[PDB]
Amino acid sequence: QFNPYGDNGGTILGIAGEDFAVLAGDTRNITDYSINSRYEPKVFDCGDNIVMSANGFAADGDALVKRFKNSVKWYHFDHNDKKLSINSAARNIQHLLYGKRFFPYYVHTIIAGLDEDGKGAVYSFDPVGSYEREQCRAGGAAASLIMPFLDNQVNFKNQYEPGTNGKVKKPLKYLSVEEVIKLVRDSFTSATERHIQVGDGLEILIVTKDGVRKEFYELKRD
């Protein structure tokens, strides 16, 4: 019987700073034990300082990004070129996803940008459109490898203040863009070593008030 779904592998990672946000993804596209492409981007500038990635089944991911980019275009037409706030984009994507509740998009969706106070924002969605704003989220094949590391190094979970008998927690604080990109690069090199579907290349899209900048880094090709 025809199976309409497939797994194109890949893994994505969103991190929100004070006055910036990053959305990273590997550039490897796979089916089973074959490599389709060593460089197939799945992190996209959608306009209005919103970056998006729909990781999982590439066909459903391409379809959703295409439909959201189109949603941004028609928001401009219908509301006098008003800027689509990240919170408004997030609600719109819930409706796109829940629209196909009984034939879902097999993707884990992450969008990144700045909120209306200029502070770094990351929203993560399930396949059927439940979403929530977080300072930190990994998605796709190697999410289980990356996410506990981010809990430890971003949110300082299970770290206590030396000498305080484990009574005083290590204080939360915003990381610089330089410190965040280090954690992203180390997150992906680590995931590349231990997950066969992760490797080839890492593409990071950084979102500030100045706009959307790109950085590319090689990963192991085995």
């Binding site: 289980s144 996410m147 590391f149 979970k157 299970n158």
Partner: protein, 204 residues
Amino acid sequence: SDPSSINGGIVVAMTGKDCVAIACDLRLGSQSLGVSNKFEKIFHYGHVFLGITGLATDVTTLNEMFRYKTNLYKLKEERAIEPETFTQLVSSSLYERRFGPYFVGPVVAGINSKSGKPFIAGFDLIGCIDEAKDFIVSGTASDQLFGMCESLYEPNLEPEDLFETISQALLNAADRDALSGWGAVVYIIKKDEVVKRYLKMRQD
């Protein structure tokens, strides 16, 4: 009805400078229900430490079995078994049940009393040996532990540092697994002393 993920739990082992560390969570559950917060998964036969994740009845049974086999080894050989030899014994004993296997993920940790060389190894349920310089992981949060270990680990850590690394590797992995946690124990193993520390972690 997947035996390896009914009771849940995790083991991780790491090598340092002239030392090894092995750690486990204390949870035993019946799927969603937490039953015991005092279920240790690390046993020692002389100076050789064995962690076992998987079906708890087989964890208990294999402990009782390897105690039996190492007790007889010591009486006949007139010396405590070494990690390298014990690894081969675990492998032999698991593959003997090839077509009716124990649903377990055992981890060997210890220092060779002669050479002083730190040693760790892991096995699948039918006894394929994974010998590793860096670290070994097992259990329901193995994916989580692989991610933590592969990023946190660096070679030739001192005992006091290695403790922090393995502790943080386990705690943060267990907190992202529903069937792991409810307390943790870390064994720091030097050539001729072994410290055992109970970690404070979230009880959910």
